[PDB]
């Protein structure tokens, strides 16, 4: 007639990327990034076209998007209503990931080079963490974007105030506090393609605070790092075999050498040794045909081989490798493998992090630094209490300390004024208070609509 399942003794207490992103398709997830492309990592310059309508020099009309947005946004709504109505997945093609349709927001970063950063095609969620007021509370201040969740335990380093709603980007890569600002009144968004210019207005722009990393960036030439490299090359080889039209499935080696040109060909041969063989004469000559006993893995197995977040962690590692290499131990501490290891270890409670340091991405007191710290009288005795009491009265010591009448404490305070236990709760409490203060300062800086003088 009741529950009768002893659940508290048995059980004591999500992100869906686009189909171009989970399949690791090569515009969105590059196979190889050179040095000039690693310096321009997540800052892609405006390239000049060689063929197309914009390749011809001259004035070019922009095309405002509104009836196209209407048709395409209502196409998602038509599909939704034709299926019934309820959220509904949609990003199944690369042409779904254009900026020409849907409700765009912008997201600006406060750090120059974050430890982790999303590739094009990946999904993220907006979570509105709302700590209720003590006792009665009206309800979460409502917000235009995201879903609200009531957080007793603060996700971030600091703790939420009672009655404070904080929005945040939440995905598998990081979790970071975001702050909604209105756009400037002068700025529009121009989407240029090969055919022409297109213009949208923007109204919502978030400022993203310091990221809290949830994925560990590997270090250079490490077990995880090179395992990723080998698995990425294997996934690319399998997808080239799937794309092959001849039966026997056959590929060419210099397609793989075009994709991965920094790879020695011994490693590519090693990946092709199992699952393929080289035909030198007869039919299929100079091709790597697929072995007849080899079952080519299905789409879900290839998706289970490499994850997109592992590719983002690898791209962060090689971009940081380039930046450190270009700049000739403080910088090495600010490398994302060190900072991600430090933050994830601090979240399990392994160690603590000096919140003021050199890994601070601001360069001032705002923001945290994620680097590991370990979690671990002769004449004064002759003052004969009464004259020490009169001396404390003379110096201006407050009457509480004079009042205590604790000879021991009185003598210690008169020594301190004439100058003017454990490593456990003390240091841990100080660390926690410093982290909370830094989080509050960062939130205040993000939330200021005050104009700042040039």
């Amino acid at each position: 007639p009741w529950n009768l399942s002893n659940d508290e003794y048995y059980y004591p207490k999500i992100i869906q990327h686009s189909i171009p992103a989970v399949e690791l398709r090569q515009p969105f997830f590059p196979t190889h990034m050179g040095p000039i492309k690693l310096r321009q990592f997540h800052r892609p310059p405006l390239k000049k076209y060689s063929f197309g309508a914009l390749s011809q020099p001259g004035p070019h009309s922009v095309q405002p998007l509104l009836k196209h947005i209407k048709k395409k946004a209502k196409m998602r709504e038509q599909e939704r209503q034709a299926s019934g109505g309820g959220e509904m997945f949609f990003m199944r093609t690369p042409q779904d990931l254009t900026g020409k349709d849907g409700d765009l927001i912008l997201a600006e970063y406060s750090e120059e080079n974050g430890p982790l950063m999303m590739q094009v095609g990946m999904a993220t969620k907006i979570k509105n963490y709302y700590k209720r007021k003590p006792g009665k509370d009206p309800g979460a201040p409502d917000c235009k974007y995201g879903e609200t969740v009531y957080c007793h335990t603060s996700p971030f380093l600091g703790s939420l105030h009672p009655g404070q709603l904080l929005q945040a980007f939440e995905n598998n890569l990081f979790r970071a506090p975001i702050y909604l600002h209105k756009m400037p009144e002068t700025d529009f968004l121009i989407i240029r393609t090969r055919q022409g210019y297109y213009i949208r207005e923007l109204v919502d722009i978030f400022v993203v605070g310091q990221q809290c990393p949830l994925f560990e960036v590997p270090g250079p030439n490490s077990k995880r790092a090179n395992t990723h490299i080998r698995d990425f090359l294997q996934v690319f080889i399998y997808r080239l075999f799937w794309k092959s039209k001849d039966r026997p499935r056959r590929i060419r080696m210099e397609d793989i050498k075009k994709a991965f040109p920094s790879h020695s060909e011994s490693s590519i041969r090693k990946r092709l040794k199992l699952c393929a063989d080289f035909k030198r004469t007869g039919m299929d000559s100079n091709w790597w045909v697929l072995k007849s006993d080899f079952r080519l893995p299905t789409e879900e197995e290839i998706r289970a081989m490499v994850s997109p977040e592992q590719c983002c962690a690898y791209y962060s590692m090689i971009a940081a490798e380039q930046r450190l290499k270009d700049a000739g131990d403080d910088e090495v501490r600010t490398a994302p493998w060190n900072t991600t290891r430090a933050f994830i270890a601090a979240m399990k409670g392994k160690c603590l992090l000096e919140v003021t340091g050199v890994a601070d991405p601001t360069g001032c007191g705002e923001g945290f630094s994620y680097v590991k710290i370990p979690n671990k009288d002769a004449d004064l005795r002759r003052l004969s209490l009464k004259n020490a009491k009169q001396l404390l009265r003379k110096f201006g010591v407050p009457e509480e300390e004079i009042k205590k009448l604790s000879r021991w404490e009185v003598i210690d305070v008169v020594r301190t004024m004439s100058t003017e236990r454990f490593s456990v709760a003390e240091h841990q409490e100080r660390y926690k208070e410093e982290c909370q203060r830094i989080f509050d300062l960062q939130n205040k800086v993000l939330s200021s609509t005050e104009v700042l003088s040039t």
């Binding site: 048995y10 059980y11 004591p12 299926s83 019934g84 959220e87 509904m88």
Partner: protein, 963 residues
């Protein structure tokens, strides 16, 4: 896209019923259909009608000519000498397909008059007015007329529409398919002291000019099918729900307090089903009718549900609350997804049955806890794998034979066996759980909300089906809506578990490689059994080692046998640290039984039941004991109890005894550990040290501290030690001594539990606990030592059995004066007398059970007595008792009892096809062939039960015992 098999489209139907005569069991009425022809030259219009005498038919007020023929009345000819069952199954499938409204066919063929051909070629409306009469219906609509004198409301006489699937043809002429949706207008002229409950909302209730009868007018603006239209006319006590005010509950007279207590939970079921889906309840009212001699225990129609009165309990009745609660819940789930969203073909029925069963399982999860959800899912999966390995397999979504391994045709619902129908619904909801496992639960609820929202935008249009077919779901539309909301398609999962009809069998064995620190699993499938199929997907395995619980995914291709997974450290045996579990907690384990070289504590192949599987894993006995003690999954504790019966070592006795003593274990695991401990105790006789098993534990848990042999007075307010207390002597009575006789220490203990029972102090009744005490007394009966076939009389009675017989005589006689809730002690005492007769103690005489199987007795008293008579006619090879049972199948007033007699005579047959028996005449073959052909022509469930009985007794070929 839905294109009709009928050449007309039905828009509106008026069903008017007059003159419901209860003395003569007769109704008169008319039916007026409003059809739009879609093809010109319509000429004949084919409608469905059974048992109705058609008086006249007028099309557009012009007299038309009809011809009636029902090929399903006598399926094969009387003068054909065929006696094999494949002939009857093909002829029965052809006969049901010849009256099928899902093809163009039908039983009543009306000819359009000639002058209306210029009205039918340019497609204009036709209004067909049939007036009919049911003279004395057999299974159409049930008349329950008691034989107390007085007025028909004073004696408690009522009518209700019974049947399953398309059985509305049995009481008015219609297009009896789930795809012909129309709006409805229902008028019923009943007595002034009676109320007529039906589908729609009651727009008015006018009196007749003599004020002796009144007409109830119902209107149904949501377009439903004819198969979802029902009726209940009786002297019902009306109760408006005090929480939800569009919900009215109707009960039989003098049962209003039971109705108040029973239907007081239903608003929470409404709130659940309207908050997991986001659609409100689609109909404008809801009506629950509780009736006598019901067809099924719960039937769900459009805006109406018909339950039996045997679900009604009071506040002091436990062990019945959860069952009635879940009957109400599954009726409401079928209100959402069987009556509002309907079927497009007979295929795509698995979609609706799966959605109904799946959301009812979500209700059970929220209401009774995840542990009860896991236990229910495991018992349904064990049910399916037992049925599919027993006979062939259940094929959801066949394509039109597709399944030729069984003895019936799966093209129509009315040719299915009843056990196949039950396993069909069971497999449908488990496959929907599998689709939730692949595509997450929030996307699944979004699929269901999209279907409901398309149906509710469709339900308000007036266009005659331009848009009313969005209320019909198909398989392709369901998969397309899944692909719309998620972007993943489930076509491999649909191809494996729906289109293919099989379950998988896994045989696993492991070996730990100490050198390379790996765990070499060896998983092989039995794919050559008749019910099985080959699995090639991924497979989850959960290994509990000393460092914690780790999940691994294995790819089990056809040529795969050895799977090497890596193992972690054993540094939690160096220091005593706690071993972390599957959840976040950690416990202290006694690692003295573990091997020194292996870190792994237990292995579970497919823990989440993500395939339809039967696992046979070969662990070591200490791994089964660790999995019984420290696991945080109830299905793993149950399977470790089930696997500890093969290891009777005293460490396993200690494991089960520690499970039994442990509150904060799920109670259904301890109830299984009782029977496992009884089996282990029986197997280690001449080794057992102290008292019998569970006795000291019973006196420690449920008896007084100062008196060990006096039980505590009954306080049943905990509901988990109540169930454990009433299940522990039932398992304790299965204890056996060196001579194989039950010990006189356990029998005396059970008799002292019976004598010192005091129930004057708890707020709950004692009928189930006392009934389980009679079951425990029946479990202790060992076969008697008859010498030279001595007539067993009370002089040569066993001294043990005289006490048992005195107790069951006292209990049955006291039930005759102070009855229990549902005569649970009558059922238990009849079962115990049959136990004493099965051994050589009481004379083998069926006259007592034949007197308890009369119509006057309660359905449970009846089905227990008829079970005893079926067991008697199996053991004593009685000819006259089999003729008694077959006569009771032919003419009994309650059709549920007839179905239950055929069911029990199929489960416990008097002979099988292998046996030579004296009961293999040509006379019995002719009787059962006449019962399949004629005789059971009015029920569609008695005919499938007769087909099942003929298959069980004589097989698929010609009976070998045919002179």
């Amino acid at each position: 896209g839905f294109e009709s098999p009928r050449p007309y489209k039905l828009t509106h139907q008026v069903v008017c019923i007059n003159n419901i005569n209860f003395q003569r069991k007769s109704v008169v009425g008319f039916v007026e259909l409003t059809i739009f022809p879609t093809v010109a030259n319509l000429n004949r219009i084919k409608l469905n009608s059974k048992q109705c005498r058609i008086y006249r038919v007028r099309i557009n007020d012009l007299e038309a000519a009809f011809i009636y023929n029902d090929p399903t009345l006598e399926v094969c000819h009387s003068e054909s000498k065929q006696r094999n069952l494949n002939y009857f199954s093909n002829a029965y499938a052809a006969a049901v397909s010849a009256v099928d409204p899902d093809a163009g066919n039908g039983e009543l063929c009306i000819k359009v008059p000639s002058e209306l051909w210029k009205h039918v070629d340019e497609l204009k409306v036709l209004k067909i007015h049939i007036n009919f009469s049911l003279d004395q219906p057999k299974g159409g609509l049930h008349f329950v007329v008691p034989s107390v004198e007085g007025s028909m409301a004073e004696r408690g006489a009522h009518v209700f529409s019974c049947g399953y699937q398309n059985s509305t043809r049995f009481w008015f002429p219609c297009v009896d398919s789930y795809s012909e949706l129309c709006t409805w207008k229902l008028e019923f002229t009943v007595d002034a002291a009676m109320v007529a409950v039906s589908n729609g909302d009651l727009v008015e209730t006018v009196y007749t000019h003599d004020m002796r009868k009144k007409t109830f007018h119902y209107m149904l603006t949501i377009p439903t099918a004819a198969s979802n239209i029902s009726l209940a006319i009786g002297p019902f006590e009306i109760l408006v729900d005090p929480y939800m005010h569009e919900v009215t509950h109707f009960c039989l007279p003098q049962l209003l307090p039971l109705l108040k207590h029973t239907t007081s939970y239903l608003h929470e079921v409404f709130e659940f089903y309207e908050e997991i889906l986001t659609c409100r309840y689609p109909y404008s009212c809801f009506k629950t009718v509780f009736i006598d001699e019901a067809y099924v225990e719960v039937a769900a129609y459009a805006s109406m549900s018909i339950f039996s009165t045997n679900l009604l309990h009071s506040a002091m009745i436990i062990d019945e609350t959860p069952l009635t609660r879940r009957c109400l819940a599954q009726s409401l789930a079928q209100q959402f997804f069987g009556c509002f969203i309907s079927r497009m073909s007979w295929s795509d029925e698995w979609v609706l049955k799966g959605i109904s069963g799946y959301i009812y399982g979500l209700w059970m999860k929220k209401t009774f806890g995840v542990n009860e959800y896991r236990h229910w899912i495991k018992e349904e999966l064990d049910k399916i794998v037992a049925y599919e390995l027993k006979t062939g397999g259940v094929l959801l979504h066949p394509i039109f034979n597709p399944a030729s391994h069984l003895h019936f045709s799966i093209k129509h619902p009315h040719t299915l066996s009843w056990e196949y129908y039950s396993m069909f619904q069971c497999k449908a909801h488990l496959v929907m759980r599998l689709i939730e496992n692949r595509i997450s639960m929030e996307f699944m609820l979004q699929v269901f909300n999209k279907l409901l929202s398309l149906a509710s935008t469709a339900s308000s249009q007036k266009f005659q089906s331009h848009m009313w077919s969005q209320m019909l779901v198909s398989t392709s539309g369901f998969l397309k809506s899944i692909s719309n909301v998620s972007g993943k398609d489930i076509q491999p999962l649909i191809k494996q578990w729906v289109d293919q009809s099989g379950v998988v069998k896994f045989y696993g064995s492991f070996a730990f490689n100490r050198k390379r620190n790996v765990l070499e699993l060896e998983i092989k499938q039995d794919y050559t059994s008749p019910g099985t199929q080959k699995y090639v997907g991924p497979l989850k395995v959960t290994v509990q080692e000393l460092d914690g619980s780790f999940n691994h995914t294995l790819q089990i291709e056809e040529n795969s046998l050895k799977h090497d997974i890596p193992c972690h450290s054993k540094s939690r045996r160096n220091k005593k640290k706690k071993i972390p579990l599957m959840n976040g907690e950690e416990v202290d384990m006694d690692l003295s039984a573990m091997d020194a070289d292996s870190p792994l504590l237990w292995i579970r192949i497919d823990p989440d039941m993500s395939v339809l599987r039967k696992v046979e894993f070969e662990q070591a006995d200490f791994m089964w004991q660790y999995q019984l003690r420290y696991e945080r999954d109830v299905v793993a504790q149950q399977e470790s109890i089930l696997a500890l019966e093969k290891f009777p070592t005293p460490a396993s006795r200690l494991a089960l005894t520690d499970i039994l003593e442990q509150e904060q274990c799920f109670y259904r695991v301890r109830m299984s550990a009782c029977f496992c401990l009884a089996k282990i105790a029986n197997s280690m006789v001449s080794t057992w040290t102290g008292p019998p098993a569970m006795k000291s534990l019973f006196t420690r848990m449920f008896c007084c501290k100062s008196c060990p042999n006096i039980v505590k007075t009954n306080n049943f307010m905990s509901f988990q030690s109540y169930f454990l207390q009433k299940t522990m002597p039932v398992a304790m009575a299965l204890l056996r001594d060196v001579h194989n006789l039950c010990p006189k220490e356990v029998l005396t203990f059970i008799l002292d539990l019976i004598k010192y029972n005091d129930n004057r102090k708890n707020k709950f009744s004692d009928n189930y606990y006392r009934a389980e005490m009679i079951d425990a007394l029946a479990n202790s009966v060992t076969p008697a030592v008859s010498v030279n076939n001595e007539v067993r009389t009370l002089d040569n009675l066993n001294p043990d059995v005289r006490l048992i017989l005195e107790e069951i005589t006292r209990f049955l006689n006291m039930e005759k004066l102070l009855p229990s809730y549902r005569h649970t002690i009558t059922v238990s005492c009849l079962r115990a007398i049959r136990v004493l007769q099965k051994n050589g103690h009481v004379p083998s005489d069926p006259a007592l059970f034949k007197s308890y199987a009369e119509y006057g007795h309660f359905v449970d008293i009846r089905i227990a007595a008829l079970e005893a008579v079926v067991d008697y006619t199996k053991v004593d090879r009685s000819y006259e008792e089999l003729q008694w049972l077959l006569n009771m199948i032919q003419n009994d007033p309650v059709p549920y009892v007839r179905h239950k007699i055929l069911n029990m005579l199929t489960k416990n047959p008097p002979f099988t096809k292998n046996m030579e028996s004296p009961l293999c005449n040509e006379a019995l073959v002719d009787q059962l062939w006449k019962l399949m052909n004629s005789g059971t022509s009015h029920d569609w469930r008695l005919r499938c039960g007769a087909v099942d009985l003929y298959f069980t007794l004589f097989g698929l070929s010609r009976p070998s015992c045919l002179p």
